[PDB]
Structure 1
Amino acid sequence: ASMTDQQAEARAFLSEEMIAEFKAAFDMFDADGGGDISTKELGTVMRMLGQNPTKEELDAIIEEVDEDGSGTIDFEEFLVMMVRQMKEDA
């Protein structure tokens, strides 16, 4: 899919330092994923970080990153959901 592109540019848009910030924050819901929280909790991880994922929008991303055959979201693949939304708050 064309997501493999926004997966590397989603975290590269900033310095690796920030990525470490989303670690303790993104892992806040990785009690059973470790490197990926339930797509349902994908709105709180990016929202509690300082952004605001809308349901209609958060739903399009989940179903989009959920059809990968995993059911949840990956850290690197989730980054896009961070900058893409922070693009306005940043």
Structure 2
Amino acid sequence: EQQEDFKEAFLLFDRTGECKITLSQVGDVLRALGTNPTNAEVKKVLGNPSNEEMNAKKIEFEQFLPMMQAISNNKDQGGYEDFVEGLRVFDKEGNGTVMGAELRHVLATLGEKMKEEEVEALLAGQEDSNGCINYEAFVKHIMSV
């Protein structure tokens, strides 16, 4: 029943009926549904497609839903204390504030890369007027999922 609910939520997610499902959208439905696994592991269960293979060729969602469930069971989701442990490294002056340019630098460059455009959207509407974000509010914003 919950998989059927996820299937209809995915049908409502899909951008147009012409999308039978692109691996790009497969990653996006992963991230948008109540999961957010690291991409190398889900690509591993798929079969590690090349970047051009993942871009050009198509995928079927039917087999994706079982592995979606399996990675959901693996539950690589973090924890609030773990997030605070991670973000506190940036709190160099120890007052609960981190610099937004540092966050865009590491979040774009260091891990799963995001272009400056989507990291800007990521901070759009919440970045402080001086430029220093308060990490407890940022972690809580992440917690909003």
TM-score category, normalised to shorter length:
0.5 to 0.7
C-alpha distance in 2 between matches for 1:75 and 1:49:
14
Match of 1:73 in 2: 59
The alignment's C-alpha RMSD in Å is 2.7
Match of 1:54 in 2: 38
> After TM superposition, which residue ranges in structure 1, 4 or more long, deviate above 6 angstroms?
none
The structure in which a higher percent of residues are helix is 1
| Preserved contact between residue 42 and residue 71 of structure 2 (Cα < 8 Å) | no
Match of 1:39 in 2: 23
Match of 1:29 in 2: 14
| Preserved contact between residue 26 and residue 75 of structure 1 (Cα < 8 Å) | no
Query: Which runs of structure 2 are paired with 1:6-21 in the superposition (5 Å)?
Result: 17-21=1-5
Instruction: Indicate the structure (1 or 2) with the bigger Cα radius of gyration.
Output: 2
* Structure of greater relative contact order (alpha carbons < 8 Å, 6+ residues apart): 1
C-alpha distance in 2 between matches for 1:73 and 1:21:
21
1:88 to 51, 62, 74: 74
Kindly state the Cα deviation for residue 88 of structure 1 after the two structures are TM-superposed. Answer: 2.3
C-alpha distance in 1 between matches for 2:57 and 2:15:
13
C-alpha distance in 1 between matches for 2:2 and 2:41:
24
C-alpha distance in 2 between matches for 1:49 and 1:25:
8
Please list every run of 5 or more consecutive structure 2 residues that lacks an aligned counterpart in the other structure: 76-145
- Relative distance call for 1:24 and 1:30 in structure 2 (3 A) is farther
Please list every run of 5 or more consecutive structure 1 residues that lacks an aligned counterpart in the other structure: 1-16
C-alpha distance in 2 between matches for 1:46 and 1:56:
13
The structure in which a higher percent of residues are strand is 2
Q: Helix, strand or coil: the match of 1:72?
A: coil
Question: Structure 2-normalised TM-score?
Answer: 0.37
